[PDB]
Coordinates of C-alpha atoms in Angstrom, one line a residue:
Chain M
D1 CA 82.9 124.7 138.5
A2 CA 85.1 121.6 137.6
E3 CA 84.2 120.9 134.4
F4 CA 85.9 117.4 132.8
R5 CA 87.3 116.3 129.6
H6 CA 84.4 116.2 126.9
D7 CA 84.8 113.4 124.3
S8 CA 84.8 114.6 120.5
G9 CA 86.1 113.9 117.0
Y10 CA 83.0 113.0 115.1
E11 CA 83.8 111.8 111.4
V12 CA 81.7 112.6 108.2
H13 CA 82.5 111.3 104.6
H14 CA 80.8 112.0 101.3
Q15 CA 82.4 111.3 97.9
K16 CA 81.7 111.0 94.6
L17 CA 83.6 109.3 91.9
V18 CA 83.3 107.4 88.0
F19 CA 85.2 103.8 87.8
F20 CA 85.0 101.9 84.1
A21 CA 82.4 104.2 82.6
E22 CA 82.9 103.6 78.7
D23 CA 84.9 100.6 78.5
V24 CA 85.3 96.8 77.0
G25 CA 85.6 94.2 79.1
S26 CA 88.3 92.3 77.4
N27 CA 90.9 89.6 79.7
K28 CA 91.7 92.7 82.6
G29 CA 94.2 91.6 84.8
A30 CA 93.7 91.4 88.6
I31 CA 93.2 95.0 89.9
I32 CA 93.5 95.4 93.9
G33 CA 94.6 97.1 96.9
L34 CA 91.7 99.4 95.7
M35 CA 90.1 102.0 98.2
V36 CA 88.7 105.6 98.2
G37 CA 86.5 107.6 100.9
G38 CA 87.8 106.3 104.3
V39 CA 90.7 104.4 106.0
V40 CA 92.3 101.0 106.1
Chain G
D1 CA 78.1 121.6 139.7
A2 CA 80.8 118.7 138.8
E3 CA 80.5 117.7 135.1
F4 CA 81.8 114.3 134.0
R5 CA 83.4 113.2 130.9
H6 CA 80.7 112.9 128.1
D7 CA 80.7 109.8 125.5
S8 CA 80.4 111.3 122.0
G9 CA 81.8 110.7 118.4
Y10 CA 79.0 109.8 116.1
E11 CA 80.2 108.3 112.5
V12 CA 78.0 109.6 109.5
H13 CA 78.9 108.5 105.4
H14 CA 77.0 108.8 102.1
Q15 CA 78.6 108.2 99.0
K16 CA 77.7 108.1 95.7
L17 CA 79.7 105.8 92.9
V18 CA 79.2 104.2 89.3
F19 CA 81.6 100.8 88.4
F20 CA 81.2 99.1 85.4
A21 CA 78.5 101.2 83.3
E22 CA 78.9 100.6 79.7
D23 CA 81.4 97.4 79.4
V24 CA 81.5 94.1 77.7
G25 CA 81.9 90.8 80.4
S26 CA 84.1 89.1 78.4
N27 CA 86.7 86.6 80.8
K28 CA 87.8 89.4 83.4
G29 CA 90.5 88.7 86.3
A30 CA 89.7 88.8 89.8
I31 CA 89.1 92.0 91.0
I32 CA 89.5 92.0 95.1
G33 CA 90.1 94.3 97.8
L34 CA 87.9 97.0 96.9
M35 CA 85.8 98.9 99.6
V36 CA 84.6 102.1 99.6
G37 CA 82.6 104.3 101.9
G38 CA 84.0 102.9 105.4
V39 CA 86.9 101.8 106.9
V40 CA 88.0 97.8 107.3
Chain X
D1 CA 86.8 127.7 137.3
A2 CA 89.2 124.9 136.6
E3 CA 88.8 124.1 132.7
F4 CA 90.3 120.8 131.7
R5 CA 91.4 119.5 128.4
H6 CA 88.6 119.4 125.5
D7 CA 89.2 116.4 123.4
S8 CA 89.2 117.5 119.4
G9 CA 90.0 117.5 115.7
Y10 CA 87.0 116.1 113.7
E11 CA 87.9 114.9 110.3
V12 CA 85.9 115.8 107.2
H13 CA 86.5 114.2 103.6
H14 CA 84.9 114.8 99.8
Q15 CA 86.6 114.4 96.6
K16 CA 85.2 113.8 93.1
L17 CA 88.1 112.3 90.5
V18 CA 87.0 110.6 87.4
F19 CA 88.6 107.0 86.4
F20 CA 89.2 105.5 83.1
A21 CA 86.0 107.5 81.0
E22 CA 86.4 106.6 77.8
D23 CA 88.9 103.5 76.8
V24 CA 89.3 99.9 75.5
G25 CA 89.6 97.1 78.1
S26 CA 91.9 95.5 76.0
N27 CA 94.7 93.3 78.0
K28 CA 95.5 95.7 80.8
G29 CA 98.2 95.0 83.7
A30 CA 97.4 94.8 87.2
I31 CA 97.1 98.4 88.9
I32 CA 97.0 98.5 92.6
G33 CA 98.2 100.6 95.8
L34 CA 95.3 103.0 93.8
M35 CA 93.7 105.0 96.9
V36 CA 92.6 108.7 97.4
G37 CA 90.4 110.7 99.7
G38 CA 92.1 109.5 102.8
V39 CA 94.6 107.9 104.9
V40 CA 96.4 104.2 104.5
Chain W
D1 CA 126.7 52.6 117.2
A2 CA 125.3 54.4 114.6
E3 CA 122.8 57.8 116.0
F4 CA 120.0 58.6 113.5
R5 CA 119.0 62.3 113.6
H6 CA 116.9 63.4 116.6
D7 CA 114.0 65.5 116.4
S8 CA 113.8 68.4 118.7
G9 CA 113.3 72.6 118.8
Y10 CA 110.3 72.6 121.5
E11 CA 108.5 76.2 121.4
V12 CA 107.8 77.8 124.7
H13 CA 105.8 81.4 125.7
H14 CA 104.9 84.1 128.5
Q15 CA 103.8 87.3 127.8
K16 CA 102.4 89.9 130.1
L17 CA 101.3 93.3 128.8
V18 CA 98.4 95.9 130.0
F19 CA 95.7 97.1 127.0
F20 CA 93.4 100.2 127.9
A21 CA 93.9 100.6 131.7
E22 CA 91.9 104.0 132.6
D23 CA 90.4 105.2 129.2
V24 CA 87.1 106.6 128.6
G25 CA 85.0 104.2 125.9
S26 CA 83.6 106.9 123.4
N27 CA 83.3 105.9 119.5
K28 CA 86.6 104.7 118.9
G29 CA 87.6 103.6 115.1
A30 CA 88.0 99.8 114.3
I31 CA 91.5 98.7 115.6
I32 CA 92.8 95.1 113.9
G33 CA 95.5 93.3 113.1
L34 CA 96.7 93.1 116.8
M35 CA 98.5 90.2 117.9
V36 CA 101.5 89.6 120.7
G37 CA 103.1 86.3 122.3
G38 CA 103.1 84.0 119.4
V39 CA 103.3 84.2 115.5
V40 CA 100.6 84.1 112.4
Chain S
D1 CA 131.0 55.6 115.8
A2 CA 128.8 57.6 113.3
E3 CA 126.9 60.8 114.5
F4 CA 124.3 62.2 111.9
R5 CA 122.7 65.3 112.2
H6 CA 120.7 66.7 115.3
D7 CA 117.6 68.7 114.9
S8 CA 117.6 71.9 117.0
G9 CA 117.1 75.6 117.7
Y10 CA 114.2 76.0 120.3
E11 CA 112.5 79.2 120.3
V12 CA 111.5 81.1 123.4
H13 CA 110.0 84.4 124.0
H14 CA 109.0 86.8 127.4
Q15 CA 108.2 90.2 126.6
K16 CA 106.3 92.8 128.9
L17 CA 104.6 96.4 127.8
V18 CA 102.3 98.8 128.8
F19 CA 99.8 99.8 125.9
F20 CA 97.0 103.0 126.5
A21 CA 97.6 103.7 130.4
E22 CA 95.9 106.4 131.4
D23 CA 94.5 108.2 128.2
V24 CA 90.6 109.4 127.0
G25 CA 89.1 107.5 124.5
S26 CA 87.7 110.1 122.1
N27 CA 86.9 109.3 118.6
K28 CA 90.6 107.2 118.0
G29 CA 91.5 106.5 114.6
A30 CA 92.2 103.4 113.0
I31 CA 95.6 101.6 114.6
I32 CA 96.8 98.4 113.0
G33 CA 99.7 96.2 111.8
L34 CA 100.6 96.4 115.3
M35 CA 102.4 93.4 117.0
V36 CA 105.1 92.4 119.6
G37 CA 106.8 89.5 120.9
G38 CA 107.1 87.3 117.8
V39 CA 107.3 87.0 114.4
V40 CA 104.4 87.5 111.5
Chain K
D1 CA 135.2 58.9 114.4
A2 CA 132.7 61.0 111.8
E3 CA 130.8 63.8 113.1
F4 CA 128.2 65.1 110.8
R5 CA 127.0 68.7 110.7
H6 CA 125.0 69.3 114.2
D7 CA 121.8 71.8 113.4
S8 CA 121.8 74.6 115.9
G9 CA 121.0 78.7 116.3
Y10 CA 118.4 79.1 119.0
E11 CA 116.4 82.5 119.0
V12 CA 115.9 84.3 122.3
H13 CA 114.1 87.4 122.8
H14 CA 112.9 89.8 125.9
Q15 CA 111.9 93.7 125.4
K16 CA 110.2 96.1 127.7
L17 CA 108.7 99.2 126.1
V18 CA 105.9 101.7 127.4
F19 CA 103.6 103.0 124.9
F20 CA 101.3 106.0 125.7
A21 CA 101.6 106.4 129.2
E22 CA 99.8 109.9 130.7
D23 CA 98.3 111.5 127.0
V24 CA 94.7 112.5 126.0
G25 CA 93.1 110.3 123.8
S26 CA 91.7 113.5 120.9
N27 CA 91.3 112.7 117.2
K28 CA 94.5 110.7 116.8
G29 CA 95.8 109.5 113.2
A30 CA 96.2 106.2 112.0
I31 CA 99.2 104.7 113.6
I32 CA 100.5 101.7 111.7
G33 CA 103.4 99.7 110.7
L34 CA 104.6 99.6 115.0
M35 CA 106.3 96.8 115.4
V36 CA 109.4 95.5 118.1
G37 CA 111.0 92.5 120.1
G38 CA 111.5 90.8 116.6
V39 CA 111.1 90.8 112.8
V40 CA 108.7 90.7 110.2
Chain O
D1 CA 77.1 92.3 57.7
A2 CA 77.3 93.9 61.2
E3 CA 79.4 92.0 63.6
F4 CA 79.1 92.5 67.4
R5 CA 81.6 92.2 70.0
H6 CA 82.8 88.3 70.3
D7 CA 83.5 87.2 74.1
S8 CA 86.8 85.4 74.8
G9 CA 90.4 85.2 76.7
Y10 CA 89.6 81.3 77.7
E11 CA 93.1 80.5 80.9
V12 CA 94.7 77.7 81.2
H13 CA 97.0 76.8 83.4
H14 CA 99.8 73.6 84.3
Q15 CA 102.7 73.6 86.5
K16 CA 105.0 71.1 88.0
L17 CA 106.7 71.7 91.3
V18 CA 108.6 70.0 94.1
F19 CA 108.0 70.8 97.7
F20 CA 110.0 69.4 100.6
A21 CA 111.4 66.1 99.1
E22 CA 114.1 64.7 101.6
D23 CA 113.8 66.6 104.8
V24 CA 113.8 66.0 108.7
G25 CA 109.9 66.8 110.1
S26 CA 111.2 68.7 113.6
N27 CA 109.4 71.4 115.1
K28 CA 109.2 73.8 111.9
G29 CA 107.9 77.4 112.3
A30 CA 104.4 78.1 110.7
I31 CA 104.7 78.5 106.6
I32 CA 101.6 80.8 105.1
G33 CA 100.9 82.6 102.0
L34 CA 102.5 79.8 100.0
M35 CA 100.6 79.4 96.4
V36 CA 101.3 78.7 93.0
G37 CA 99.7 78.1 89.4
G38 CA 96.9 80.9 89.2
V39 CA 96.1 83.9 91.0
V40 CA 94.4 84.9 94.2
Chain I
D1 CA 81.0 95.5 56.2
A2 CA 81.2 96.8 59.8
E3 CA 83.4 95.2 62.3
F4 CA 83.0 96.1 65.9
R5 CA 86.3 95.6 68.3
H6 CA 86.3 91.5 69.4
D7 CA 87.6 90.8 73.0
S8 CA 90.6 88.7 72.9
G9 CA 93.8 88.5 75.5
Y10 CA 94.0 84.6 76.7
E11 CA 96.1 83.7 79.8
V12 CA 98.2 81.0 79.8
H13 CA 101.0 79.3 82.3
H14 CA 103.2 76.8 82.8
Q15 CA 106.2 76.8 85.4
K16 CA 108.2 74.4 87.1
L17 CA 110.7 74.7 90.1
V18 CA 112.3 73.1 92.7
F19 CA 112.3 74.0 96.7
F20 CA 113.8 72.2 99.6
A21 CA 115.2 69.2 97.7
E22 CA 118.0 67.7 100.5
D23 CA 117.5 69.6 103.9
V24 CA 117.4 68.8 107.5
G25 CA 113.9 70.2 108.8
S26 CA 115.0 71.8 112.3
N27 CA 113.4 74.7 113.6
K28 CA 112.9 77.0 110.5
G29 CA 111.5 80.1 111.1
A30 CA 108.3 81.4 109.1
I31 CA 108.7 82.1 105.4
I32 CA 105.6 83.7 103.8
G33 CA 104.4 86.1 101.0
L34 CA 106.0 83.1 98.4
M35 CA 104.5 82.7 95.1
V36 CA 105.3 82.1 91.7
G37 CA 103.4 81.2 88.0
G38 CA 100.7 83.8 88.2
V39 CA 99.9 87.7 90.1
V40 CA 98.6 88.5 93.3
Chain E
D1 CA 84.6 99.1 55.3
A2 CA 85.2 100.2 58.6
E3 CA 87.2 98.6 61.1
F4 CA 87.0 98.8 65.0
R5 CA 89.8 98.4 67.5
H6 CA 90.2 95.1 68.4
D7 CA 91.7 93.5 71.5
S8 CA 94.6 92.1 72.2
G9 CA 97.8 91.6 74.4
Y10 CA 97.8 88.3 75.3
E11 CA 100.1 87.1 78.2
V12 CA 102.5 84.0 78.7
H13 CA 105.0 82.6 81.2
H14 CA 107.3 79.7 81.9
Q15 CA 110.4 79.9 84.2
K16 CA 112.6 77.4 85.5
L17 CA 114.3 78.1 88.8
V18 CA 116.2 75.8 91.5
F19 CA 115.3 76.6 95.1
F20 CA 117.2 75.4 98.2
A21 CA 119.1 72.0 96.9
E22 CA 121.5 70.7 98.9
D23 CA 121.4 72.8 102.1
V24 CA 121.0 72.1 106.2
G25 CA 117.8 73.3 107.4
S26 CA 118.8 74.7 110.9
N27 CA 117.5 77.8 112.5
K28 CA 116.8 79.7 109.3
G29 CA 115.5 83.4 109.6
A30 CA 112.1 84.6 108.1
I31 CA 112.5 84.9 104.6
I32 CA 109.5 86.6 102.5
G33 CA 108.8 89.0 99.4
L34 CA 110.2 86.2 97.6
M35 CA 108.3 86.0 93.8
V36 CA 109.3 85.4 90.3
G37 CA 107.4 84.3 87.3
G38 CA 104.6 86.9 87.1
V39 CA 104.4 90.8 88.7
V40 CA 102.6 91.3 91.9

């Protein structure tokens, strides 16, 4: 029979990162625009 | 028979990150725009 | 029978990076534009 | 006679756009920053 | 007589665009930074 | 008589574009930086 | 004797700027993102 | 004796700028992204 | 005795600029990305 267009394209994400493990916390500047595991 | 378009595209997310483990808490600047595991 | 166009192109991502493991936290400059595991 | 500076610069706007006419409503991502007919 | 500076420079805008007329609505990514008919 | 500088330079804009007329809506990537009819 | 890490990095700011001294107030556009003497 | 790492890197700022001293205020466009004396 | 690493690198800034001293304020375009005395 007639088969119309089927919607799809499911997203799936799973990261695993380490940030600032062993480090002093002196007067650090301003860090930004930082992002991971995804878009926008 | 006639089959109309079926809606789909389910999202699924699951991260695991480490932030500031062992570090002093001196006068740190302003960190922002920080985001992970998702969009926007 | 007639087969219309089927929608597809599902995305899937999974990284694993290490950032700033063993390092002092002196007056570091401003780091930005940093991103991984994805687009935009 | 003496003529001081006259204030002016009146704004006027009038658009006409079509957004999402005939389209399924599956799991669409997040659209933003979208704006028209004006500033800011 | 003496004629001081007259203020002016009136803005006027009027577009007409078509966005997403006939298209399925599958799992579309995130569209942004989209703008027309104006500044900023 | 004395004629001081007169302010001017009025802007005027009017485009007409077609975007995504007849096209499927599969898993499209992320489109950005898109802009027309103006500056910035 | 043993001397643990001492917290420090005190901030201090003091500017002095002039904005819009002698100027008419016609239909000025929208100015934003304007900031000084500090971060964020 | 044993001397552990001392936290430091104090910030200090002090500018002095002139903006728009003697100028008419006609229909000026939209100025933005302007900043000084600091980061971000 | 044992001397661990000492945190340092204090920032200090002090500019002095003149912007738009004597100039008419006609329909000026949109100026941006303007910044001085600092980073980012």
